[PDB]
Amino acid sequence: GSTLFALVRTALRIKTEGNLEQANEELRAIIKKIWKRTSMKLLDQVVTVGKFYATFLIQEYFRKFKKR
Amino acid sequence: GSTLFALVRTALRIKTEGNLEQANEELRAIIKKIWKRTSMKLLDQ
Amino acid sequence: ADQLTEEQIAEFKEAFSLFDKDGDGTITTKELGTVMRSLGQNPTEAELQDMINEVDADGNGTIDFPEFLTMMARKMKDTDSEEEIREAFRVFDKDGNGYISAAELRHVMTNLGEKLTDEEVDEMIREADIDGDGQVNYEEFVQMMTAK
C-alpha cells in the first residue's frame, strides 16, 4: 500500500510551493507599498504673488510660436 | 483641514505594518513546513 | 479617480470600512470618535463635527464613500514625478553619498514614528537592492517607486 499517500504528497507539495511563491510576492508588494507610502508621507514633511500677467505672457509666446 | 486624512493615514499605516508582520509569519510557517517535510522524505530513504 | 486605480479605490474602500463600523455606508461622528479614542486621542463632540464638515460635501452631517474618496484621491499624492522621486531620495540618503544604507533608512523610519523592526528594515533594503551590493542607489530607488 501507501500509493495514495504518495499521490496526496505530490499534490500537497505543489500546493506548498505555490503558497511559497504567493507569500514571497505578497511580501514584495507590501514592502513596495511601504517604500511608497513612506516617500509620499516624507514629501509632506518638507517645510503679492500675482500670476495673471505671467500666464498671459506665456499664452502670447505660444501664439507667436505658432505664427513664426 | 487634513485632520480626517491624518487619521486615515495612521489607520492605514498600522494596517500595513500588520500586513508585513503577518506576511513574514506566513512565510516562516511555509518554510518550516518545507524543512520538516523534506527531512521526513529524507529519512524515508 | 481615473488618475486613481481600481486597486487604489479598493484600498480606500477598505480604509473607509475601518471607520464605517456597522457598514451602513456612512461615517458618523460617533464612529469617528470610536476610532480616534482607539488611537489614543480624545476629541470633543465639536472637533468631531469639524472633522466631518471638512469633507461632508452634501452637508448632510455624515461622510459617505464618494466624499471619503474625493478627499483621499486629493490628499493621496502619487510620488511618481521624476522631481518627487529625486527629493524623496535625498531625504532617505542622509549623507547624500548616493546610496541609502540600512542605517539611514532605519533613522528615517524611527523618526517618522514608523513601527518597523530592524529586521523589517533590512528586508526593505534587500528587496530594493537590485544589484545586491548591500545598499540602495538612485536607479534602484526609481525602480522601487515605479513598479507593479
Place this chain on the structure above:
Amino acid sequence: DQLTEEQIAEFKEAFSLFDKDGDGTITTKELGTVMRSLGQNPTEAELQDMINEVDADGNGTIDFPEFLTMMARKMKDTDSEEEIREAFRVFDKDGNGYISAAELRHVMTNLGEKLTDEEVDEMIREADIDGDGQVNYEEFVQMMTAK
C-alpha cells in the same frame, strides 16, 4: 499707447484660463486651482489678498473690467522685468534655474495647449542658445522679449 480690440481679446483669453466655470468672475477658489496646477500652493489668506488686489468694486471676485485694468497697467510698465521672472518661475518647477522639456510640457498642458512633442522640442531647441538642452533665465528672457 492704447488698447486695441485684439489686445483686449488676448487679455480675455488669459482671463478665461482662470474663470474655470465660465461665469464671468474669477474667485479665490479658481485662482487656487490654477496656481496649484502651475506648481504653487498659496494659502487661503494669500488667495484672498491676491483677489483683493485686483477686485476694484470690492465684491470679492474679479470680473473682466477689473482684470483688464490690472493687465493693461502691467503691460504699460515696461521698466519692470518681474513679470518675465514670474513667467520663468511658473515653468521652473524644481526651481533649479533651468527649464527642461518636461517642465515646458507640464505648463503647456495645464494651460490648455496641446502642442506635439515635435513642437515642444522645437521650442526648447530654438530657445536653448548654449546648446545644453535646457532654457536658463537669460535664454528665457530672450525667447520672451522676442517673437
Place this chain on the structure above:
Amino acid sequence: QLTEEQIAEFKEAFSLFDKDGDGTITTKELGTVMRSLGQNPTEAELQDMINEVDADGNGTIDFPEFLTMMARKMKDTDSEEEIREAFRVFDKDGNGYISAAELRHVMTNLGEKLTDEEVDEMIREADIDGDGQVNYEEFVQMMTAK
C-alpha cells in the same frame, strides 16, 4: 497529534480529489487527478489506492478514512534520533553546517526542486544567528516547533 492546520490542509486535499464534491473519492476521480498530473494509471492501480485506505470496504473513500491514512503516514519526524540523522545527511560534508549548496543538493536527490533563491530563503529562516549557515542547534529548533 494532528494540528488544526494539518487537518485543514488534508481536508482541502480531500476536496480537490472529490471532484463532484459528494463527500467520497472514487477510482475515477482518482484517475482524473492522476492524469491531470500527467500520470497514466491502470484500473488495477486505482483499485489498489482505494483498498489501501477503504476501512469500511464500501468501495470509495470518505474524509474520515482519508484523514486516518494521513494522520498515520504524515506522522511528525521529531524524535532526537530522527533529527540527529536528518542533520547528519543534510550536512553532507559533515562540517556541522548545512549550506545552501548542501540543501540545494538535497532538493534534487528528492526531486524537491526549488529555485536557488528559495533555497537561500530556507537557509536564512533556519539560520538563527545569521552567520549564513545552519548548525545543529538551529536545525533542531527548525525541526521542533509549532
